[PDB]
């Protein structure tokens, strides 16, 4: 499986790769010097995990796919928008009920796991965060969770 790689000179970020191919190695001397490649399925290095409320205002060098979206409703239905992406959930749990949208897995309703019903047919899970992405609305309180991605 993939492994978290961090470098001594770049300690802030974290790569996620796996050992691939090793370069030819001599069968003498008793003091060898060679190399090996580490294939990273995701070319981005990720910093620390951050939990922000509603909008991201941090200087993001690249559009970031989130890690978790913690929604808490206030009105009847859920309609999350930033201008480009529209996340919608008809017949949602109205009257202050938490809906976890874990990007690196599945969706949750309050405590129990709810995948089949949670999101509507025209909802988005391919959402990306720019330096000025705003989701703030009077209908829901969002706790956005993401990791800064750099190349």
């Amino acid at each position: 499986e993939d492994v978290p790689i961090i470098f001594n000179d770049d300690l802030e970020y974290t790569f996620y790769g796996r050992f691939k191919t090793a370069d030819n190695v001599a069968g003498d001397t008793n003091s060898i010097i060679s190399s090996f490649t580490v294939l990273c399925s995701d070319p981005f290095k990720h910093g620390k995990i951050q939990s922000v409320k509603n909008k991201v205002i941090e200087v993001l060098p690249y559009p970031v796919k989130p890690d978790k979206l913690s929604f808490k409703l206030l009105t009847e239905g859920l309609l999350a928008t930033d201008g480009n992406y529209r996340l919608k959930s008809s017949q949602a749990k109205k009257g202050d009920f938490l809906e976890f949208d874990f990007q690196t897995g599945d969706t949750f309703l309050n405590g129990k796991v709810n995948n089949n019903l949670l999101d509507l047919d025209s909802d988005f899970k391919n959402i990306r965060l720019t330096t000025g992405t705003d989701f703030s609305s009077s209908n829901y309180e969002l706790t956005i969770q993401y990791r800064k991605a750099v190349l």
């Binding site: 620390k48 922000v52 205002i57 941090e58 200087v59 800064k148």
Partner: protein, 299 residues
């Protein structure tokens, strides 16, 4: 006026911000508009004053500038700094940061700050001449001049008294006037607000009324414990005559010399402050505001 919008973090490095480019001779036009961010979210710095900190060059050790920022929205975590002549002094690459401070007089309480960021000053037709820093010299000279006033002022006064000694000996025979003024002196020390100056910091933007009372042996102040004093509940209550003076969120309470009491300052969670020194209590009651801090005036 021109503005330069940047978002600055306290946690992450500030390398991804755009190129800030200033012009050397621009006076008070070019302003850096910054959004303070902590771990991706805006930073509330309510109760803190932002400061622009320009770092000096490592070679010469000149160019350190600490300047208080005029405009800020502490709630929304934003600030506007107008480049100073000091910020524009070095033509080339500059390194700076914002520091947020809280000071109770001559000492810091809490300080946090952004990560450094860089900016560039471009060359102008004008080239400002800068004097070499002399904060120490100006200070040591003001201290010397003031100490010279002490030495010379002492010598001028002692010569004045000795020259007028002959007229000071024949001013009052026996002590008819002296006896009198000593009776006026004791009444001025008790009945007029002159000597004792106390400061009450408050939450009002206005001038709240203050009422002061003096009493001995109130509950829990007695020397030998509860109900050990001669008069249970407290002795004679004296309304203290006051002279009130106001500044923004500060009342200066002037009382007669006799009521001078330096003890433990107790703040009640409303419009009341007490000063307790053993059995003696000095009580301050504020109408229409809450006392936030109380202390004896020092100049």
């Amino acid at each position: 006026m021109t503005e330069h919008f940047i978002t600055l973090s306290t946690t992450e490095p500030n390398n991804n911000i755009g190129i800030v480019k200033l012009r050397h001779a621009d006076v008070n036009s070019q302003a850096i508009v910054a959004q303070i961010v902590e771990n991706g979210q805006p930073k509330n710095f309510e109760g803190l004053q932002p400061f622009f900190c320009l770092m000096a060059q490592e070679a010469t050790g000149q160019g350190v500038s600490e300047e208080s920022v005029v405009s800020f929205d502490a709630k929304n975590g934003t600030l506007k700094y107008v480049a100073s002549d000091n910020a524009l002094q070095f033509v080339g690459r500059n390194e700076a940061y914002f520091s947020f401070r809280k000071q109770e007089g001559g000492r810091w309480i809490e300080q946090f700050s952004t990560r450094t960021f860089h900016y560039i000053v471009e060359k102008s037709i004008y080239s400002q001449p800068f004097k070499d820093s002399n904060y120490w010299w100006t200070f040591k000279e003001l201290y010397r001049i003031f100490n010279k006033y002490i030495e010379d002022g002492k010598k001028s006064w002692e010569q004045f008294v000795e020259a007028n000694r002959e007229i000071l000996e024949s001013i009052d025979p026996g002590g008819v006037l002296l006896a009198k003024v000593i009776d006026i002196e004791k009444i001025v020390n008790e009945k007029v607000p002159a000597g004792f100056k106390f400061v009450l910091e408050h939450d009002s933007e206005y001038q709240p009324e203050v009422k002061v009372t003096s009493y001995k042996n109130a509950i829990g102040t007695e020397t030998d414990g509860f109900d050990s004093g001669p008069v249970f509940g407290g002795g004679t209550i004296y309304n203290v005559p006051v002279s009130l003076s106001y500044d923004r969120q500060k009342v200066y309470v002037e009382m007669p010399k006799s009521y001078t009491l330096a003890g433990d300052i107790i703040l009640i969670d409303d419009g009341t402050l007490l000063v307790i020194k053993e059995t003696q209590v000095l009580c301050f009651k504020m109408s229409d505001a809450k006392i936030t801090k109380g202390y004896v005036f020092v100049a």
